[PDB]
A = this chain, B = another copy of it.
Amino acid sequence: DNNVVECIKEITESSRNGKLVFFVGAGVSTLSDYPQWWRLVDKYHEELYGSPKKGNYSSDEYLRIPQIFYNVKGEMAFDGILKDFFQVDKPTNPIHDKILAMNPAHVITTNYDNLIDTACWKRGKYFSVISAEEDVANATSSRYLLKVHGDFRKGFKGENVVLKEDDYLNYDQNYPLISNLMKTIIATHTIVFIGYGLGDYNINMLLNWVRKLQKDSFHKPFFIRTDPSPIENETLIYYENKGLRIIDAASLIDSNEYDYLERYSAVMDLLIESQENKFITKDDEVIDYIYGKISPLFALQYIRKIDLKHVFE
């Protein structure tokens, strides 16, 4: 698609300049088979009501039933279920390193795992992992692996992560500093949403925040969409009106319903190879491209032939 190749140009330009930052949602953690929140919801509902909700869980349920577990059974039971489910460890899929292949200045994410942390461990990308209020001050590096909702580095406990209903309802008071840092990273760096999903509460609050204070003064965040099927027109147009650059790789690279890693890698390589792939087709494009590289050269009085190597890459 013409729109998609335009997005490719913008994203790859930001990667060239290091202006690219990646919002990583729970979907990336799903690919590595990290435990999902809805499995935990089913557990919670089974313990409370004696059996999981037979019908599909609503967002209100998804948030309240962890909160019900927090209330009737107590906080320590909540932390216990957290420990039993999320103590499992899995490796980092290539998608994390490919995300780092874009050379981001920051890595924003709502995740609570440390799969990106381990991926930068292998790739040796020292992003200062901010995950709490106190983490703001001790920030060692300008680069940030910003855990928007925190993670279990200190331990597997509820307070360490934004999981239950209250945290989503009381996020602003709980994380004003991380909110500020996030707001400004969105303000200046070009942004990508991955694994975030369209309709997630986080994407909703972020869209509200950008639409609130910015008046044609935001860098349209990108939403690389990794879904079983191509995006629907109605949903795509609706979300674009909100303001977003949604890149749906299902149409670009064909993939069956569960070809999740496949289309993740497909979009990631659509970015990676495109930046290294300098497209030039036409014959008049010979003069156009060669002059686009030689346009600055006219100013200098004379230039060595040897130095032209850096001009044409």
State the A residues within 8 Å of B (CB). Answer: 18, 133-134, 136-139, 142, 176-177, 180-181, 183-184, 187-188, 212-219
Contact = CB atoms under 8 A, between A and B. Distances in A.
A180 B184 contact: yes
Given A181-B187, A183-B180, A184-B180, A216 B139 contact: no
18 contacts: A18-B142, A133-B214, A133-B215, A133-B217, A134-B214, A134-B216, A134-B217, A136-B187, A136-B188, A136-B213, A136-B214, A137-B214, A176-B212, A176-B213, A180-B180, A180-B183, A181-B184, A181-B188
Given A137-B213, A137-B219, A142-B188, 14 more contacts: A133-B214, A133-B215, A134-B216, A136-B187, A137-B187, A137-B188, A137-B217, A139-B188, A177-B187, A177-B214, A180-B180, A181-B184, A181-B187, A181-B188
Nearest to A128: B188
Contacts of A219: 137
A78 B218 CA distance: 32
Nearest to A105: B142
A21 to B, nearest CB: 12
A133 B212 CA distance: 11
Ordered nearest first, which 5 A-B pairs have the shortest CB separation?
A: A137-B217, A133-B214, A176-B213, A184-B184, A134-B217
